[PDB]
Amino acid sequence: ALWAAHNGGTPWDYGATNNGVPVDGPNGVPVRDPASGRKYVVKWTTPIMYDGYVNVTVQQGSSSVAPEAIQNAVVNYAQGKVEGEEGLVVGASLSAFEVAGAIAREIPGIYIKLCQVACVAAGSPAPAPGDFTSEYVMSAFGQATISVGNVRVTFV
Amino acid sequence: ARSSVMRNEARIANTINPNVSFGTFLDAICALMGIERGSDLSTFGYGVQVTGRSQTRISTGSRVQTPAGAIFTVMSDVTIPAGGVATIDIKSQEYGNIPLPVGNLIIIDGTIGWSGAKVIASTRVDPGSRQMSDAELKNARVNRLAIQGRNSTMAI
Amino acid sequence: KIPLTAVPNQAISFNAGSSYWKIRLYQNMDMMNADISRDGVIVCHGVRCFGGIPLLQYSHQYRPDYGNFVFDRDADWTLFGDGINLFYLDGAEFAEYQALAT
Amino acid sequence: LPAYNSDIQQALKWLHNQAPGITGLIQRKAQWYDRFSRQFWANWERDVFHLKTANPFGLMVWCIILGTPSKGFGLYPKNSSWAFGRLRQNFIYSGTQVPPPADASPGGNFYGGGNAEILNLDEIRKVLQLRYVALISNGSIAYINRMLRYIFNDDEPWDEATGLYFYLMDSTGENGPVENLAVYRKDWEGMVLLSSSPRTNHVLTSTPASDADWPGVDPAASGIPVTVETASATAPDGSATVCKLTKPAGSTAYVSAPIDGPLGSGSTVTFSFFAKAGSTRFIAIQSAADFPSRADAVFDLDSGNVISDQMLDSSVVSARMIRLENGWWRCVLTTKTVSSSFRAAYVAPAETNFSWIDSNSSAAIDVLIWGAQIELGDTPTGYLKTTGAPVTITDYVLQNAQTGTVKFTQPLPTGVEAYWTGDWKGGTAAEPARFAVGNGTQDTFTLSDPAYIGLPTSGAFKLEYRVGPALNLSPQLINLMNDRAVGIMPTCAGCDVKVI
Known part of the structure; x- marks a missing residue:
């Protein structure tokens, strides 16, 4: 697909030992040519997987709902089932305000107390509660992911 | 004479527009890319026939296979006393038909000749069936003009 | 839509899209042909008829704000009134259709 | 739909038959x-x-x-x-x-x-045509090349042996190391491809010994089983170890060399059987499976065409014959079965080409057999002697890739010549190229030079065209297109164009 689009005078190699990790060093070994051609080379990278940590505090109100319902609603919002919200695509920052908005649009008539978030490198141990924040700016070459069990909820 | 010549001249008054058809448009689209004809027969080889002895199968016999496809033979041949010969087939319509690898049925019957049957050693030649009449040509031109519309990044 | 009939040579006038229209349909050789006039002044001559593509090709004709005409399938003077129709589109719908064309 | 005549001669009428004048006028107007x-x-x-x-x-x-x-x-x-x-x-x-x-x-x-x-x-x-292609292009080079093939070669596959015509490699390089090599070795037995991975050969006995060695099975019990014995004839490899078996009249018999099972788990089965001239011009083979799923084939020894082969399961892949000198051939069979219940393989002589393996006999027919082998693959490999147990050999290994060298497991004999294919030093060697000359004791060699490609062509905003001599394209145009004023090549702002 990448080899279909080319300009004729511009190389594709990229990397500064800190941006998105390339799949392979010298080349991704593209096909030579569908018809009457020889081998060509081109380079592409992939984003850096991340894990997000969010704290939510809520009051039941007058109707009781299991935490797993809210958790699943949030996580399958993160993939973007609903029109108007693309999701956590490459180079997309994450803010607790938009998470609260997704919750509200998903179910009205409920009260929200607090919502703070954090995000660190994937594979690291769970951080302390002092590592959370309202919004986490995330890099151009980064990808953020979410997990159902990763999110911890408090039904005060 | 006057009416005929005047109507004929009015027939091809405008042709450069991609609305026209019938050969002039064939050339206009081949200016970029385009195939025509594409109307062959599912010609075969290595037929299977068990019959009586020292008899001749007449040319242009009829053969039918289970979803009622009509197939004619090509060449006339004699049968050796063993009861096995190779035949050549052709289809009624100029279409890319699909043959089911099953023992066939007979429409036109010679004497003492049965078992129109497949063989997995038979050559299979898939024919075109007037694959591009008039409108898919415009669709292809539209697709290619959409392709050339994009710039470097948007195309990627 | 446009009410028609099965006759090799016909012409109808109608008032739609806040404008006066007059269309003449006649068989020529093998393909259908059309002549279109608006507000008593000629517009275009000898338009070939085809399924799905608009009747008005050149840019200055079809609309600053006016509409256009499209045939669903290839026409045949014997089939009008049964399974073959002609439809009219205003500016907005025709623009949407043109966007979908590409 | 209604027809349109538009004919001049319609004016003439049956009133006008013996009139030379008026008919003459009308007809002459018609030709005009x-x-x-x-x-x-x-x-x-x-x-x-x-x-x-x-x-x-x-x-x-x-x-x-x-x-x-x-x-x-x-x-x-x-x-x-x-x-x-x-x-x-x-x-x-x-x-x-x-x-x-x-x-x-x-x-x-x-x-x-x-x-x-x-x-x-x-x-x-x-x-x-090229100018219009340039006026329509956006910059992508692959479609420019496909245009190029269509306009010059008329949509026909090329041959690099004359270093044919392509746009270029651009700043992108062609290739570095070597990938996907192959071993094409010319010898007595013609072309054979080899595999770096070790290969299994499950044939218990390379040659039959007697009826006890390869048992014969008869359903009908209408006659004596087919006999087997070893006679002397000039083997292709240079010895006399051929085998006889004759099929007496009124017997429907087949001998099977006992092989271990199961052979594999629903993968390819490549049966092989040397083609030896016999009294009969046809040889019948069979690769049985779970009852009933046998898939079999028949080879024309004299002419070299497969005739009989069938469906009981989804088994077969293909079967093809390879010519050898002095009245011998090479026979292969390929099979992919969804199941894996391989049981036995049967081989027995047949009278006619269409005859089946289990057909009856009308007289006594004789044929020669030698050198059986079986392997799990889709392509035949070299022959290797077996007895009592499978024999597994790795013939070659790539000792250094970036160097361009290979060490063989054994020193090749004298007169052994080899080819190769793949991608190396930026070149293409799809057509096999000689690289090794085995004199008898050597086992270290170095690959030859492919048709060569200027792989890197380093430089941003750099592009030029490369031409072949086979097409006999005139140098007048070559001089012509270098100019910019006429503007007849695809281009993008910020680069430069050279015909060569």
Whole structure:
């Protein structure tokens, strides 16, 4: 697909030992040519997987709902089932305000107390509660992911 | 004479527009890319026939296979006393038909000749069936003009 | 839509899209042909008829704000009134259709 | 739908039969309008038809359509040019005074002057086609190349043996290390491909010994089983170890070499069986499976065509014959079965080509057999002796890739010659290329030089074209297109263009 689009005078190699990790060093070994051609080379990278940590505090109100319902609603919002919200695509920052908005649009008539978030490198141990924040700016070459069990909820 | 010549001249008054058809448009689209004809027969080889002895199968016999496809033979041949010969087939319509690898049925019957049957050693030649009449040509031109519309990044 | 009939040579006038229209349909050789006039002044001559593509090709004709005409399938003077129709589109719908064309 | 006649002769009527005059007038009017109203349009369409446009006027019209300069094109070798006629011998060297040059274009020698002038209309047709391709292109090079193939090679596969024509490699390089090699070795037994991975051969006995060695099974019990014994005949490899078996009348028998099972788990099975000339011109084979799922085949020993082969399961892949010298051939069979219940393989002689393995016998027929093998793959490999147990050998291993060298497991014998294919040093060697000359004791060699490619072609905004000599493309155009003013090549702002 990448080899279909080319300009004729511009190389594709990229990397500064800190941006998105390339799949392979010298080349991704593209096909030579569908018809009457020889081998060509081109380079592409992939984003850096991340894990997000969010704290939510809520009051039941007058109707009781299991935490797993809210958790699943949030996580399958993160993939973007609903029109108007693309999701956590490459180079997309994450803010607790938009998470609260997704919750509200998903179910009205409920009260929200607090919502703070954090995000660190994937594979690291769970951080302390002092590592959370309202919004986490995330890099151009980064990808953020979410997990159902990763999110911890408090039904005060 | 006057009416005929005047109507004929009015027939091809405008042709450069991609609305026209019938050969002039064939050339206009081949200016970029385009195939025509594409109307062959599912010609075969290595037929299977068990019959009586020292008899001749007449040319242009009829053969039918289970979803009622009509197939004619090509060449006339004699049968050796063993009861096995190779035949050549052709289809009624100029279409890319699909043959089911099953023992066939007979429409036109010679004497003492049965078992129109497949063989997995038979050559299979898939024919075109007037694959591009008039409108898919415009669709292809539209697709290619959409392709050339994009710039470097948007195309990627 | 446009009410028609099965006759090799016909012409109808109608008032739609806040404008006066007059269309003449006649068989020529093998393909259908059309002549279109608006507000008593000629517009275009000898338009070939085809399924799905608009009747008005050149840019200055079809609309600053006016509409256009499209045939669903290839026409045949014997089939009008049964399974073959002609439809009219205003500016907005025709623009949407043109966007979908590409 | 209703028909349209549009015929002049409709005016004539049955009142007019023996009238030469009025019919003459009407008919002559008919040919007049046929000439100047219909055939004219046919010729005009055929001329504006671009793929075989012959009119220089049409070509000039096309150029005006595209706006290109046309001074660099030979307009016409036609009669209308200066100094061209039936006699045209006046005021010229007619052999009386001085011998004039003979290999030249018809007409005066002064026409088509300059090294940039082109005189064969065909490449002009190509240059306008290429110009339009340039005017429509966006910059992607793969489609430019596919255009190039269509316009020059007429959509026909190329051959790198003449270093054919392509846009270029651009700043992108072609290749570094070597990938996907192959071993093509020429010997007595023709072409054989080899595998770096070790190969299994489950045949218990390379040659039969007696009926006890390879048992025979008879369903019908209508006669004696087929006998097996070892006679002496000139084997292709250089010995006398061929085998006999004859099929007496009134027996329907087959001998099977006992092999271990199961052979594999639903993968390819490549049966092999040397083709030895016998009394009968046909040989029958069978690769049985779970009952009932047997798939079998029959080979024409004399002519070399497969005849009988069938479906009981989804088993077979293909079967093909390879010629060998002095009345021997190479037979292969391939099979992919969804199940994995391989049980046994049967081989027995047959009378006619279409005859089945289990058909009855009308007389005594004899045939020779040697050198059986079985492997799990899709391509035949070299032959190797077996006895009592499978014999697994790795013949080669790539000791250094970036060096371009290989060490073989054993020293190759004398006269063994080898080829190879793959991608290396930026080159392409799809056609096999000789690299090794085995004199008897060597096991270390180095690959030859492929057709070569200028792999890196380093430099941003750098692009040039590479041509082959086979197409006999004129150098006049090569001089022509280097200019920028005419503008007849795909380009992008910020780069430079060179024909070579």
